[PDB]
Amino acid sequence: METWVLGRRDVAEVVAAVGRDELMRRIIDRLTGGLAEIGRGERHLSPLRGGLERSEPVPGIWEWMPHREPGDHITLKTVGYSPANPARFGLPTILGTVARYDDTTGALTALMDGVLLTALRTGAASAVASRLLARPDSHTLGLIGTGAQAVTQLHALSLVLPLQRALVWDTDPAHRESFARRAAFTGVSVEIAEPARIAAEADVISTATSVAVGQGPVLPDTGVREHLHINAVGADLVGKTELPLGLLERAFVTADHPEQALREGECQQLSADRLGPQLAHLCADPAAAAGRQDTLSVFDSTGFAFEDALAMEVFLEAAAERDLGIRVGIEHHPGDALDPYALQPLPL
Amino acid sequence: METWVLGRRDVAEVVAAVGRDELMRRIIDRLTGGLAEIGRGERHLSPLRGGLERSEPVPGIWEWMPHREPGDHITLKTVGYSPANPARFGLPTILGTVARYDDTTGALTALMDGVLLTALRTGAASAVASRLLARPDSHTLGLIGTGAQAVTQLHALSLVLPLQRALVWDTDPAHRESFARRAAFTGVSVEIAEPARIAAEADVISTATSVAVGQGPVLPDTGVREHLHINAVGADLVGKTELPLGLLERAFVTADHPEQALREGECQQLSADRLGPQLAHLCADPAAAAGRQDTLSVFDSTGFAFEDALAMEVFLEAAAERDLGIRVGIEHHPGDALDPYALQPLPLPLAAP
Numbered sequence: 001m002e003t004w005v006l007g008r009r010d011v012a013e014v015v016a017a018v019g020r021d022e023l024m025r026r027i028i029d030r031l032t033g034g035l036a037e038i039g040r041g042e043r044h045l046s047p048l049r050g051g052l053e054r055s056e057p058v059p060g061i062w063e064w065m066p067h068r069e070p071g072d073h074i075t076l077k078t079v080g081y082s083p084a085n086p087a088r089f090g091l092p093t094i095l096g097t098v099a100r101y102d103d104t105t106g107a108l109t110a111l112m113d114g115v116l117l118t119a120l121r122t123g124a125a126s127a128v129a130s131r132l133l134a135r136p137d138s139h140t141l142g143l144i145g146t147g148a149q150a151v152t153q154l155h156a157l158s159l160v161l162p163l164q165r166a167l168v169w170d171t172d173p174a175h176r177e178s179f180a181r182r183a184a185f186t187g188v189s190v191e192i193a194e195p196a197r198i199a200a201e202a203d204v205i206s207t208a209t210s211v212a213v214g215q216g217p218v219l220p221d222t223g224v225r226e227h228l229h230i231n232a233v234g235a236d237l238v239g240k241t242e243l244p245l246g247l248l249e250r251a252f253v254t255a256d257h258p259e260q261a262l263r264e265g266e267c268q269q270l271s272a273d274r275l276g277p278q279l280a281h282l283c284a285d286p287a288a289a290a291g292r293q294d295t296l297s298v299f300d301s302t303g304f305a306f307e308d309a310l311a312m313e314v315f316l317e318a319a320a321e322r323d324l325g326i327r328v329g330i331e332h333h334p335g336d337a338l339d340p341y342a343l344q345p346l347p348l
Numbered sequence: 349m350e351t352w353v354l355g356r357r358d359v360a361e362v363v364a365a366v367g368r369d370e371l372m373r374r375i376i377d378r379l380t381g382g383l384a385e386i387g388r389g390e391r392h393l394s395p396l397r398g399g400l401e402r403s404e405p406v407p408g409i410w411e412w413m414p415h416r417e418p419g420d421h422i423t424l425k426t427v428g429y430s431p432a433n434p435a436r437f438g439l440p441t442i443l444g445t446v447a448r449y450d451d452t453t454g455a456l457t458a459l460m461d462g463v464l465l466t467a468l469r470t471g472a473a474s475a476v477a478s479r480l481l482a483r484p485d486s487h488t489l490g491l492i493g494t495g496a497q498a499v500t501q502l503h504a505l506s507l508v509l510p511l512q513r514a515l516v517w518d519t520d521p522a523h524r525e526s527f528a529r530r531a532a533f534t535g536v537s538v539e540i541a542e543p544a545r546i547a548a549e550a551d552v553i554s555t556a557t558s559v560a561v562g563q564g565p566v567l568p569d570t571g572v573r574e575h576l577h578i579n580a581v582g583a584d585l586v587g588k589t590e591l592p593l594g595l596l597e598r599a600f601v602t603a604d605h606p607e608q609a610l611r612e613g614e615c616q617q618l619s620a621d622r623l624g625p626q627l628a629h630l631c632a633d634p635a636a637a638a639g640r641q642d643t644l645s646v647f648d649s650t651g652f653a654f655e656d657a658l659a660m661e662v663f664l665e666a667a668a669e670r671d672l673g674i675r676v677g678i679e680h681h682p683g684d685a686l687d688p689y690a691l692q693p694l695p696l697p698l699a700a701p
């Protein structure tokens with residue numbers, strides 16, 4: 001009968017009441033379970049996303065990301081990547097919303113912020129992959145790109161690895177200099193370091209940049225620690241990549257969603273037959289993976305809508321428990337299903 | 349900064365304030381103008397829609413339909429086709445919503461009902477096509493399928509043609525028997541007739557059925573009037589058609605969106621090279637359909653997002669005039685754009701507890 005809307009105030013209230021670490025852990029755990037279900041064939045990857053490329057102000061994309069859970073509900077995330085937003089408008093680069101529709105009737109049942117949820121599930125996905133593929137004694141995290149995603153990359157990874165420090169870089173000096181402040185709550189010490197130094201000293205790296213098509217790589221084609229694990233998180237336009245080919249070619253590479261990664265991930269640079277097993281496979285059999293901790297690995301992360309559905313369920317469970325959100329009758333359900341004009345009662 | 353939400357009460361208030369006839373005329377005018385722009389090369393057809401097919405309890409589909417106006421905004425209609433809804437749940441078959449996103453920032457700026465808007469723009473499109481291709485003195489309308497769309501097909505067509513009566517059929521007796529009451533506001537007399545009589549007597553027909561994949565036609569190929577114009581409106585799943593092949597083969601056929609129609613319309617049955625000029629080309633230059641009023645013609649209608657964007661503008665102009673809708677901060681816009689955790693929860697009390 002009415003759409004449950006959770007906007008920014010309620011989302012803030014969930015975080016305040018649950019706690020950042022606990023919320024992140026719930027999302028890590030949900031994703032881990034969901035990916036293992038996919039890996040056993042009990043659930044299935046989302047369809048490929050689509051989007052509309054926008055050339056201005058600077059090149060970006062607005063995308064739609066559906067996922068169906070048959071007999072239950074459809075999730076739709078709608079999300080912009082607008083890399084001029086922070087400096088031009090004081091808005092995040094990544095701006096979106098997540099909707100849920102009843103699978104049986106089509107009715108819009110819930111709608112909420114996608115900005116926070118996106119950042120949380122993206123950190124979580126890197127944590128799932130890094131727990132499997134990073135050495136368990138990893139002490140140094142490298143971050144290339146210190147914008148929004150970097151915050152939750154650090155946070156999530158601090159929950160699953162014994163991180164002592166983060167070596168960080170961004171092409172924008174103001175964005176790298178403010179990272180320590182944004183990261184303070186994790187307790188991981190931050191040091192600004194050049195990409196060459198990050199590549200050489202990190203045990204684990206996340207790359208999460210707004211680099212343009214034709215502007216990589218964001219790390220040099222260098223020698224790295226033999227156990228290095230990299231989460232390649234930047235992803236937006238077709239053509240956009242962050243890692244040097246010569247590094248990728250000697251890595252074990254696991255995509256979150258192989259078809260989508262081959263279009264918009266690092267796997268753009270590779271043949272399909274060069275890809276290792278997908279992340280869900282590793283989640284269903286963590287022993288396919290553990291043996292790969294000690295050699296070079298890359299998690300090619302594009303994000304996919306099932307992750308959004310799961311993250312949304314975490315928020316919906318917490319909100320329901322606290323009676324958060326409002327109810328809005330958005331869709332018109334006529335008094336007679338066969339009469340679009342049965343709008344009664346008319347106001348005044 | 350916040351999303352403008354026009355929900356069910358506000359859409360109702362627009363209909364009440366503007367009136368059903370005027371609202372539909374505005375939408376007719378707006379679609380005509382926009383289609384002409386496409387026909388002139390000033391604007392472009394929407395990308396092909398996407399969807400997720402769903403088999404139970406009866407096969408339907410949930411679709412997304414984007415249309416971008418570069419530098420201004422992106423419209424997205426999300427809409428379900430679920431043809432067990434009226435009998436099982438008392439909900440319309442077609443259920444959806446229309447959203448607008450700022451093209452520059454990606455921000456969700458507006459969200460509104462898509463149920464009414466869809467019915468209105470779908471009637472309007474048949475009026476646009478029928479004003480071009482039906483005889484101006486058409487008096488008898490036929491309707492095959494007398495569900496929700498059939499109401500606005502009659503309404504819209506009554507506004508552009510001197511209709512005196514409607515001959516109507518549905519496979520569900522209860523649905524064809526309630527059509528007179530739902531149509532009464534148009535003034536057009538309604539009589540139930542079988543499809544063969546409709547085919548023989550109508551000057552203009554609209555087909556808007558929930559017929560299943562592969563289970564057409566819904567109208568037989570038997571002795572039609574020479575000048576008949578048909579709006580083929582049913583469209584959901586790939587494989588769904590309503591008209592007989594033999595009829596289409598001898599008609600002048602115009603699609604609203606050729607590539608889309610070739611996928612989901614009657615044009616599934618035809619080759620691309622056998623289509624007439626698309627509807628946009630006819631709106632840009634009505635002479636491209638010179639003479640076709642007096643011979644067999646088919647408008648193959650599937651719907652496309654630009655139509656929703658134009659209908660949505662009509663509603664937003666009316667709702668802005670009357671200060672309608674609510675404003676809801678749905679998207680999180682952290683004070684520091686690079687800090688997803690820069691949230692602002694309500695402040696805790698200062699005073700001793």
Ligand SMILES: NC(=O)c1ccc[n+]([C@@H]2O[C@H](COP(=O)([O-])OP(=O)(O)OC[C@H]3O[C@@H](n4cnc5c(N)ncnc54)[C@H](O)[C@@H]3O)[C@@H](O)[C@H]2O)c1
Nearest residue numbers: 093145147148149171172208209210211234235301302303
């Ligand atoms: N994998 C996923 O699931 C997923 C989800 C959300 C976002 N993303 C992607 O992550 C990327 C970053 O998003 P964000 O929200 O952090 O954006 P952001 O604008 O907040 O941060 C991006 C940072 O990258 C920096 N940068 C640009 N080019 C660089 C380079 N060559 N080297 C180092 N730094 C550079 C920018 O100055 C900026 O600080 C985008 O590509 C986005 O689409 C991926």
Ligand SMILES: NC(=O)c1ccc[n+]([C@@H]2O[C@H](COP(=O)([O-])OP(=O)(O)OC[C@H]3O[C@@H](n4cnc5c(N)ncnc54)[C@H](O)[C@@H]3O)[C@@H](O)[C@H]2O)c1
Nearest residue numbers: 441493495496497519523556557558559582583649650651
């Ligand atoms: N072209 C467009 O732009 C557009 C837009 C909206 C809806 N549609 C489509 O129009 C069709 C009707 O939608 P609606 O909202 O009116 O649905 P509805 O369920 O309200 O009505 C459809 C009617 O078709 C009847 N029917 C089923 N099979 C039939 C047959 N063989 N002969 C006669 N009647 C039959 C049903 O009993 C029902 O009364 C659907 O395919 C829908 O997806 C098209």
